[PDB]
Each structure stands twice: as structure tokens, then as C-alpha cells.
Amino acid sequence: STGSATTTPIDSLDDAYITPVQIGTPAQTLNLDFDTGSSDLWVFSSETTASEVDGQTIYTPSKSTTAKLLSGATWSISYGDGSSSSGDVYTDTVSVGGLTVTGQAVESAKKVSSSFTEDSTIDGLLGLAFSTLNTVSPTQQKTFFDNAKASLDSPVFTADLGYHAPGTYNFGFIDTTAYTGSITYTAVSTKQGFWEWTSTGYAVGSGTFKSTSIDGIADTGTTLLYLPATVVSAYWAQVSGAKSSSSVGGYVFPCSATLPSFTFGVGSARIVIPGDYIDFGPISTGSSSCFGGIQSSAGIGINIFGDVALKAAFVVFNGATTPTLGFASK
């Protein structure tokens, strides 16, 4: 089997991407944030504290003839941005772009933190990291991809995120029309539960490529590109007036600037992020200070190849017995 679904930016900055997902019988369609950095499929629901729902579409398990309470199971997750959610668990039928999994754990939120409430466009998350990170207790549950894998034509999914435009998540096949050149595959460590890999270096604009190993994670659920402070300083030093602002929370730059590109290495291959992809707009409405899309990871503990990086590539998440990642230009 295969599936193919369009993913759409939630706003004009590509702050996140939403993909429609069918849950239950009859189908209830919710727009979920597909997140290769986590492993829980959770949704706003009829159980979510009413004051914490503000415009999201909710899953109502009592209206699904295939929903079954997973007795005793609870979940609770905290994300790198400080947000969190928790609740109980149902199993139900879940379909993405024509690909159906029966018995998928659907984690129903009883509580969500303010940033989720405040974003009316995201009805939940669909985790695509390794199932070892799934938070359901006392019986850990499998991701949608893990449950689908054996049925897929090939045990892979691909992320093709757009810049200020829709893109595609495919399951079970590699669309050879969706990229240019060849796909370069690189090794993955699953030891932390992530799609963790080692970039071979970087360049700023037209500058020379610096060969240096950068371990980090391919994370569709993180907006920006988070890299070591040395790399980030070298980038922003090429932008007149750019500075790191403790009060804003990262590098800002004059909105009048033209940003240089940023290149990252995948083996001997190179992925070029155009400068425009690094502009996240005014820090507050009407400001002439703009927020940068490349930020330091120094306070995170891990480097994160988020959407800013991934949207410049066609990315293969290869879930073969030994997982690997593939990157192609497009």
C-alpha cells in the first residue's frame, strides 16, 4: 500500500504545516502537525477542557463506531518549546492520504498548554519519530508509520515541504518526479529515538564550504534551523546589523536586509537553503527588526534540522531494518 497527502503551511511564515488525517468511522478529519521529532499521535477532543479549546476541530470518540477505549492508558508529553498536553487513549482507524491503519492509538487530550489553545489551525500532532519515544503508559504505543510499515510497498515516508506553499507527505514510495539529481543517503542513530544524523559541514552564501561534523535531528515539527553557536555566528556576521537579542530570544536582523543562503552537507552532497527561507518577519507587528530562521542550539542540547532546512530538500525517512535518511535537491 501507499499514501499521499498534501501538507499546507498554517500561516504566511511557514511556522508549521498541517496535513488532513481521517480518524474513526464515519471519518472525522482533523488537521495534524506531522512531527518527525516526536512519537505520539494526539488530538484535541470532546474530552479536552472546554476553556482550552479555541477554534480547533475535535475528535469525538463516542461518534466513532470503531473507537475503543484503551483501558488504563494515559499519556503526557512536553515539547522542546515548553508546550505540553496530556490525556487518555483510544484505538481507532486512522487514514492518511489513502493509507489506512486499524487499531492506531489515538491519544485524546484532556489538557493542552496555552500555545496549543492559541493556535486554532493545529488540531493535534502525528508523531513520526521512533516508537521508543511514545509516552503512553503503562503500555507504550506505536506510531502511525510503525503500524503501517509492514503493509507499505517500501518501508519509507518522505517529506517535501514547500516554501510559502503546500507540499507533500508520501508513505510507502519515493516519487522520482519530486526532486532533482540523486538522493544522498546518510546514516541514522536511533539511540535517542530521533532521526539523528551527522551533516558534513556548511557554507554561508557564496563562501567556501567548511568541513565539520554536525550531529542533529531531522525534525519536521520544529520551525527553525538550530545549529552550534559558532556556525550561527558565522552566518549572521554576513548580515549588516544582525545581532543576538536576549530580550527577543535569538538573532534578529534589519528587515531591509537581503539574506545570504546557507548550505549544509549531506555526505558529499550539498543542500542550499535560499536566503529568503531564513526570514521570519517582524518580531512584532510593524517592527523593522526581523527574526532569523537560523538560531543557536546552545541552550537546547541538540542541533535541529527543522523546517527551514528540510523545506529546501526532498527528504526520505527510510525505516528499513537499519534506518537511514536521504536528501535530494528539488
Curated annotation (Swiss-Prot):
Residues of the full protein shown: 90 to 419 of 419
Record keywords, A-Z: Aspartyl protease, Disulfide bond, Hydrolase, Protease, Signal, Zymogen
Annotated catalytic residues: D35, S199
Residues of the Peptidase A1 domain: 17-328
EC category name: hydrolase
Gene Ontology biological process: proteolysis
Protein name: Endothiapepsin
EC number in record: 3.4.23.22
Lineage per the UniProt record: Eukaryota, Fungi, Dikarya, Ascomycota, Pezizomycotina
